[PDB]
Structure formats: structure tokens, C-alpha cells
């Protein structure tokens, strides 16, 4: 789940399913601690910017899929020689493909096989615009020293 790419919501309480123009996604829940709980999933609804691209891809090349949510970690990290998140799920083969805000880098490109990028990104810094400005020589901005 991301803010602009993958939006997760709840099903319609009237009919017990998702609305149109969306994709039914299924996350698992583990509540018991002393005993191991049988596989039990919930039914959510996923949409966003990457979901429409996935729909268009599935319409272009004919294949079927079944989305679900990751629960092991987040995007992917290598802890003691083992990959978590979506990177780890594709590596131990429970997922086939992973879609979302996964950025192509050299460390992950040795255990998976990324595709052509569909959007540019990188690293940036966000600061709050202060009430100040820049005008140290505003009185000298008028007529130069020649006149």
C-alpha cells in the first residue's frame, strides 16, 4: 500500500464485495499467539495508479492473476542473507511478480528481473517554506554606481 499508487479500502457492507473499477485483494490476519491459527484471510479492495497499469497489461497479454497483500516486511530488505517483503516473496517462489513502488537498484537486480521503468523517481529533500526571502542589497538594486 502506498499513498498515490495502491489504495486499500473496505468492501461494500450492503452486498459484501468490492465496488467496480477496483480489484479484490486479500490480506491474512494472525490473532492467536499460543496456538497456530488456520489460514484465514480478509477481503479488501485495492486500486490506484499501478492497478490500472496492471489491468492494461493483463488486457494486452492474456493472463489471469489474484492479488494479495504482503505481511512479512515492507518493500524488501536483506537481513542476515535473507530477503523480506515483496523482494523475499518473489525469491522463495510464492509470488511470480510484485507490483507497486519498488525501485530498480543493483542489489535487488541480482535476485530478480526488473522490467522497463514506467515512471521516474529518485531522492529529494522536503522543507517548509519559511516567511523569509532574499534581499540583502535591495537598496542597491536601483541605479548602479556609475550614475
Amino acid at each position: 500500500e502506498e499513498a498515490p499508487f495502491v489504495i486499500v479500502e473496505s468492501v461494500d457492507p450492503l452486498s459484501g464485495t468490492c465496488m467496480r473499477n477496483t480489484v479484490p485483494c486479500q490480506k491474512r490476519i494472525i490473532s492467536e499467539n499460543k496456538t497456530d491459527e488456520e489460514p484465514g484471510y480478509i477481503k479488501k479492495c485495492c486500486k490506484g495508479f499501478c492497478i490500472d497499469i496492471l489491468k492494461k497489461i493483463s488486457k494486452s497479454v492474456k493472463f489471469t492473476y489474484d492479488l494479495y497483500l504482503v505481511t512479512n516486511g515492507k518493500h524488501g530488505k536483506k537481513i542476515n542473507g535473507t530477503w523480506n517483503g515483496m523482494i523475499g516473496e518473489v525469491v522463495m517462489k510464492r509470488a511470480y511478480m510484485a507490483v507497486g513502488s519498488l525501485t530498480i537498484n543493483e542489489e535487488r537486480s541480482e535476485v530478480v528481473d526488473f522490467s522497463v521503468p514506467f515512471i521516474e523517481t529518485g531522492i529529494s529533500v522536503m522543507v517548509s517554506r519559511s516567511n523569509g526571502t532574499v534581499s540583502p542589497s535591495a537598496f542597491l538594486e536601483p541605479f548602479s554606481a556609475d550614475v
Binding site: E2, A3, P4, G48, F49, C50, D52, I53, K56, I57, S60, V61, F63, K74, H75, K77, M86, I87, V90, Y96, M97, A98, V99, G100, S101, L102, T103, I104, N105, E107, V112, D113, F114, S115, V116, P117, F118, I119, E120, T121, G122, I123, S124, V125, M126, V127, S128, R129, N131, G132, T133, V134, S135, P136, S137, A138, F139, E141, P142, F143
Partner: protein
């Protein structure tokens, strides 16, 4: 008299005599009115079309490399378990530790801490921060400069190694790029409200930070006056 007449005649002065003196001073007085009126008008135009400047220049600034050499130290951090932390760790060690002693837990918490003065800078992905800057209650949040990445990369689909669908997915993505669907998708989902043309915020202080040049000039002038005074005194003493 001729120096006072052009800086708003204020100083007590004595006027000359006869027709010649009166006409020479009157033509000089007309010079002063035009010169003074265009100065205030030009200065007003500069204050109305001014433009702000960024606080920092990037990740290679002195505030990010030497935070302890200034005022109470600059506060910047990021959320761990990502790609930006792995990028920073391999290129900067002391900066990595300094920003790791200021860890966060999410994007919304980071924005709240930045709005409540609990943080000075937040380093994260480019598209996410651009979306957060283009969609905000007001336009208080902004990105340094005008929008710039430091580690160019992109979002891709992770498929299993040595597969048969990679070429087909790449061709489909390139076909979607060649038809124009990406522009429609970005106009539908990646639209913004803020980030208009950087006009003036109409500052209302004009404090000592901006008006220090006139005081420096007055100090230099009084120093030169004292120097000329002591020089004339030493010359008259000999």
C-alpha cells in the same frame, strides 16, 4: 546646498543672490525632483517582482556534513528499511548515523513533525514527496530548488529470474508509452494543486537581516570621517 537639494532639502542652507544664482539653482532643483521620483518607483518594482531562494543546495551542503559547527544542530532524518537508507549508508557514514539518531515511522508522521517544527528536513522518495507537495492543506510544504533527484532510478515490476513474460511485459509497457496512456494516467492520478509559479510572499518585516547594508555604509562613513579628522588634526599640528 547643491548636495542637500538632491537628497530631500532638509538641512538649513543659505541661497545665493541675483538673477544668475537663482536660475542656476532652479534648474538644478528640477534635476532633483526627477532623479528622486524614479528611484522610489524602481525600488517598488523590485520589491513587487522579487523572488525567494532555497535554504540548502542538496545533500552535499555544509549543514548535512558538519551539523555541529552551527547553531543548535540541523534536524534531518528518514524512515529506515528502504532504498534511500541503503544509498546513504554506502556513501556517507557520519551523516547516516546522525540521521539514524533521528529516525521516523512514516510519511504522515514526518510531515506532522515538519509542520510542528520538530524537524527541519525530510529525505524520502521523489515521486511521493512531489505528490505530497502538490496535495496539501495550503502550500506550506515545498521541495528544495525546483524539483530535483540525486539518484536517478524508476519503478519497475519484479518478475522471477529467467522467465518468458519479461519481454512481453516490456513490449506492452513500451506500447502503452507510445500510445499516450501514461499522460492520461498521470493527469488522472498524479495531478496537483500547489507548486504554481514562485511569486513573492509579500514579506512584512524588513528586519535587520535585509537592512544591514545601510548601517554598514554609515559605519564606514563615520570611520572615514574620524580618519579624516585625525589626519587634519595631525596636519595642523605640524
Amino acid at each position: 546646498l547643491l548636495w542637500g537639494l538632491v537628497f530631500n532639502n532638509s538641512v538649513p542652507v543659505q541661497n545665493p543672490k541675483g538673477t544668475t544664482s537663482k536660475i542656476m539653482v532652479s534648474v538644478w532643483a528640477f534635476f532633483a525632483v526627477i532623479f528622486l521620483a524614479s528611484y522610489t518607483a524602481n525600488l517598488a518594482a523590485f520589491m513587487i517582482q522579487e523572488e525567494y531562494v532555497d535554504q540548502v543546495s542538496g545533500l552535499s551542503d555544509k549543514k548535512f556534513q558538519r551539523p555541529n559547527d552551527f547553531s543548535p544542530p540541523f534536524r534531518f532524518g528518514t524512515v529506515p528499511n528502504g532504498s534511500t537508507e541503503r544509498n546513504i549508508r554506502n556513501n556517507y557514514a557520519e551523516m547516516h548515523a546522525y540521521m539514524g539518531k533521528f529516525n521516523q515511522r512514516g510519511v504522515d508522521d514526518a510531515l506532522l513533525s515538519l509542520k510542528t517544527g520538530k524537524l527541519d528536513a525530510f529525505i524520502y522518495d521523489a515521486a511521493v514527496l512531489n505528490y505530497m507537495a502538490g496535495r496539501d492543506e495550503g502550500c506550506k510544504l515545498v521541495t528544495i530548488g525546483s524539483g530535483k533527484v540525486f539518484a536517478s532510478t524508476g519503478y519497475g515490476i519484479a518478475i522471477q529470474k529467467d522467465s518468458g513474460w519479461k519481454r512481453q511485459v516490456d513490449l506492452a509497457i513500451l506500447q502503452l508509452f507510445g500510445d499516450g496512456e501514461m499522460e492520461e494516467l498521470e493527469a488522472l492520478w498524479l495531478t496537483g494543486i500547489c507548486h504554481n509559479e514562485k511569486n513573492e510572499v509579500m514579506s512584512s518585516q524588513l528586519d535587520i537581516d535585509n537592512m544591514a547594508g545601510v548601517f554598514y555604509m554609515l559605519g564606514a562613513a563615520m570611520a572615514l570621517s574620524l580618519i579624516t579628522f585625525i589626519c587634519e588634526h595631525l596636519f595642523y599640528w605640524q
